[PDB]
């Protein structure tokens, strides 16, 4: 599961 800021 990717980190919180990965899709910013």
């Amino acid at each position: 599961e990717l980190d919180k800021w990965n899709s910013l």
Partner: antibody
Amino acid sequence: RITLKESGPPLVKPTQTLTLTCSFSGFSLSDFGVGVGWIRQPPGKALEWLAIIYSDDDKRYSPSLNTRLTITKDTSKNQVVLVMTRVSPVDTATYFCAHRRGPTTLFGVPIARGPVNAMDVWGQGITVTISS
Amino acid sequence: ALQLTQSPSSLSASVGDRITITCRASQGVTSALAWYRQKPGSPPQLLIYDASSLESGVPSRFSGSGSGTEFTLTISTLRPEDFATYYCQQLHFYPHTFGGGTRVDVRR
């Protein structure tokens, strides 16, 4: 200056519940993108990531400790609490709380996400032993 | 989970030396990697964030490079405060993995 400090009991017995508190200053958990995480360190061992909580109340836990951990924050009292149920002697370690920067903003706009790639300020750590 | 291997595990050195520690990941973590220095009895101190960015207040002798699965920390001129243990951390995947550490002791 940002500062964090861990508090709780130095000693806990097996099967018992451990509650740790992280008190901070210099930042708010209402501030955009900010997180507070917990990392522990058994004597003589490496760092182990436990959990993180963000200003938007988003939460993440260690998949291997997930059924025993609860992380929560009190924005008004600048505190983050970690509760660990049913401990054993292997839970014996130094427990740290740390700050995670949120993204850089320019006129409220997110321009850089590079600073969230680290835990920049750490507390001194609290030592907890688990013996019956 | 994500495997973060540090090399070497232990490193022998003297004051003035240039050293390099590497951190290898089982999958790409992009540039989301941090380096810390931990002296005994103290908490980890951030040196490099986002694989190469120097953190405010950290000496210029610390340097980080690499992206993807290979990362390196370079201390150009070893100072005595540097005899310690170093750690890498990954923050691209949950959970935020830590390396095993690299101990840097005084050579003899």
